Amino acid sequence: KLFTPLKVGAVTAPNRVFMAPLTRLRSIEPGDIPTPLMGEYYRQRASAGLIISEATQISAQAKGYAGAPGLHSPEQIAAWKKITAGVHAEDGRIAVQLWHTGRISHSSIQPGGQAPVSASALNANTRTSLRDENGNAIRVDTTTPRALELDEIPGIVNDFRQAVANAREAGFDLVELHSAHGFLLHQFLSPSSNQRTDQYGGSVENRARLVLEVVDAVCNEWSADRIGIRVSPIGTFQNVDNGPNEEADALYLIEELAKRGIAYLHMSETDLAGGKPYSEAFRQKVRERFHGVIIGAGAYTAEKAEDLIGKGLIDAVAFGRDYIANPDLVARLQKKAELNPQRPESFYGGGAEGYTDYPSL
Numbered sequence: 001k002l003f004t005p006l007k008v009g010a011v012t013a014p015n016r017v018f019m020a021p022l023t024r025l026r027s028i029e030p031g032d033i034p035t036p037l038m039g040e041y042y043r044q045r046a047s048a049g050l051i052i053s054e055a056t057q058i059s060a061q062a063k064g065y066a067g068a069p070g071l072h073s074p075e076q077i078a079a080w081k082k083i084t085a086g087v088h089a090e091d092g093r094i095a096v097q098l099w100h101t102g103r104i105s106h107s108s109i110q111p112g113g114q115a116p117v118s119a120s121a122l123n124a125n126t127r128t129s130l131r132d133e134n135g136n137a138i139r140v141d142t143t144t145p146r147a148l149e150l151d152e153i154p155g156i157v158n159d160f161r162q163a164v165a166n167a168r169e170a171g172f173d174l175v176e177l178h179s180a181h182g183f184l185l186h187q188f189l190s191p192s193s194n195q196r197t198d199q200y201g202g203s204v205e206n207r208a209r210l211v212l213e214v215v216d217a218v219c220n221e222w223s224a225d226r227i228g229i230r231v232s233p234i235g236t237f238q239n240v241d242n243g244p245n246e247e248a249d250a251l252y253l254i255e256e257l258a259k260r261g262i263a264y265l266h267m268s269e270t271d272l273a274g275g276k277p278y279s280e281a282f283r284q285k286v287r288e289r290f291h292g293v294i295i296g297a298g299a300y301t302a303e304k305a306e307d308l309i310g311k312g313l314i315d316a317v318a319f320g321r322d323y324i325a326n327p328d329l330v331a332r333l334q335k336k337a338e339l340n341p342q343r344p345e346s347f348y349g350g351g352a353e354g355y356t357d358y359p360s361l
């Protein structure tokens with residue numbers, strides 16, 4: 001089933017082998033600008049059923065990693081237009097993953113060198129990636145954030161809205177809202193990171209309020225059939241857990257998302273460091289609550305993907321690290337060919353080495 005077509009909102013994927021969003025931290029600074037090298041990397045992978053881009057800033061404030069691209073400035077829009085054109089030239093499809101990093105950030109890459117923002121004022125207690133004086137990636141402890149004031153929340157929603165407008169102009173086929181992995185939207189969703197006492201904290205309805213305002217805004221800006229969302233609602237991701245009622249809270253959020261008739265739900269099932277597997281019962285509960293495409297991700301194999309697609313529980317699989325190392329992953333999985341070995345040391349930062357130099361068959 002992996003090599004059969006699938007309608008995904010406004011487009012049709014020719015296969016179910018998707019490229020997961022993968023931060024590679026190779027953009028130009030100053031300007032957080034996509035490059036021709038990034039264009040080549042995505043063009044090499046255009047046989048994917050769908051490419052989901054690396055996480056991309058909705059605004060300058062959204063930045064948390066040196067080398068991550070934006071989709072807020074004219075120069076960024078112009079550069080992304082070239083990238084999507086290259087993918088389209090090879091008959092591919094590409095979604096842009098849009099984030100605000102919130103508290104997973106550092107003051108040195110924030111506007112004015114000031115503290116980053118979040119739901120509440122507590123430190124992420126993790127690291128982000130900056131660049132040193134020679135442009136090489138380095139890991140640095142996160143800066144303590146300040147809590148967004150209530151009157152700043154509409155501006156966040158507007159920044160997502162505007163970034164989706166920009167994505168449409170840049171020629172993306174779809175957008176993926178980054179509501180996972182401990183970034184801003186997840187910081188609001190999670191009780192561990194959200195201690196607010198206004199209408200954006202406390203109950204699950206309040207904790208989900210921001211992400212649902214964002215979904216509504218971007219559906220209105222473009223169209224619901226252009227919108228996907230990535231969630232990581234079971235387990236702990238970058239120190240952000242999903243709280244004591246994670247299953248019930250996940251199902252609440254998914255039911256709300258379904259009301260908007262969006263294109264897809266992308267579930268990041270496990271952190272890279274591992275987590276409890278999804279039960280089939282939970283998968284069935286998700287499936288009956290959402291009426292668009294469901295994408296599974298997190299250490300999948302082709303075998304696991306075929307099993308779950310055949311069981312009618314998911315529609316597609318996003319592969320991350322296998323896509324880093326195998327531009328023609330689709331052809332390799334179809335032919336049962338060996339994969340190129342991964343070189344994790346060059347996942348983040350640097351240049352062509354470990355990026356565009358993994359060969360196709």
Ligand SMILES: Cc1cc2nc3c(=O)[nH]c(=O)nc-3n(C[C@H](O)[C@H](O)[C@H](O)COP(=O)(O)O)c2cc1C
Nearest residue numbers: 020021022023054055297298299300319320321347
């Ligand atoms: C180098 C690296 C960068 C990643 N960057 C992102 C990101 O930008 N956005 C996101 O939602 N997930 C990101 N992830 C998670 C992947 O999308 C994926 O969930 C993870 O790779 C598990 O899938 P895999 O076992 O197929 O690699 C990243 C993972 C890796 C390895």
